[PDB]
Design a protein around this ligand. Sequence first.
Ligand SMILES: [Ca+2]
Length: 373
Amino acid sequence: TAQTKNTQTLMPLTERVNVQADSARINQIIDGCWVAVGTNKPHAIQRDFTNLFDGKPSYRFELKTEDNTLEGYAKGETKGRAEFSYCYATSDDFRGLPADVYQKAQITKTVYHHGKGACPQGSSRDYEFSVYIPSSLDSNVSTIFAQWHGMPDRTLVQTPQGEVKKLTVDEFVELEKTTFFKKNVGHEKVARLDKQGNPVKDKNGKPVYKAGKPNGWLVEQGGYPPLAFGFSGGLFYIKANSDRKWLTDKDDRCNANPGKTPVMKPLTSEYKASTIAYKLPFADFPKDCWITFRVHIDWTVYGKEAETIVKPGMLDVRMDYQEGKKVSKHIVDNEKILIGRNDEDGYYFKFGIYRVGDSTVPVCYNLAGYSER
Ligand SMILES: [Ca+2]
């Protein structure tokens, strides 16, 4: 290859923030309102000066076949991620607080709870964003391009004796000194030891540990997104999830498959629901043009420790695009639906690529034009 690459049309954006565990620095924030999460390969996220949305650069996301960097549920499964998050904290957000507050928020993974861009429990919000799906996108991709997640606080725990309780941050910080967490499961924290019997340290002198046996503690971590827009099995779909349990049970994998679950017939467990609100065959999803989605969500209201449904939620979605003339398809019409999570804290938006279902089919598309109110 002898042609010098044109690097004017695309600009890699490679800064990444673990929003639960770290504040975003000013020079990591994109357009004053986003931070990026996931793989930092230069091609993963780029500002696109050629495909403009409303006259301004859009965002091109790409995962190649080899770009799954995350472990999936079952052994042998991987997932890939390159997303923007609308919710993150900055240094400014901790102004006025004691010196140790930020470090304890890092340990409890509650940093972004101090930042902008979240919607509280039981509230209502309108969201709008646009997507551009290239005609080259494989119809068998398995990817989520917009999703709204909950924000559980892992200081809600279950003790080894089975009590669900809220630890103070200081209590959780003490527990973390003795417990190694693998996702939501506590394990005895054991120091790795070198051949002389001394604690192992990495090249920088940080003590290294590993998980011993499970120690009975569980923490509220992870969970399905309450709302996701994606492609799977040759379908565009919109999926809403609900969990009314106070401490989510991670072994309850209530997740509707759009190829198996009829539209608006919820898959339910004792505490969870997963509903496919809309499906469209892949070939019918417009290509090589900007599609604007307008989404209204009334989040389900849950009864906290009572685990009740206090008020159902509601989802409304319109899909607008050029058809010569602007048309607006009312793809989800004011549907009463269970949508949300029974947590103290609320919900935040991401868009980009979250490649799921143990897929390595390449994904590439553009996103732009986000707003919420
Ligand atoms: Ca919860």
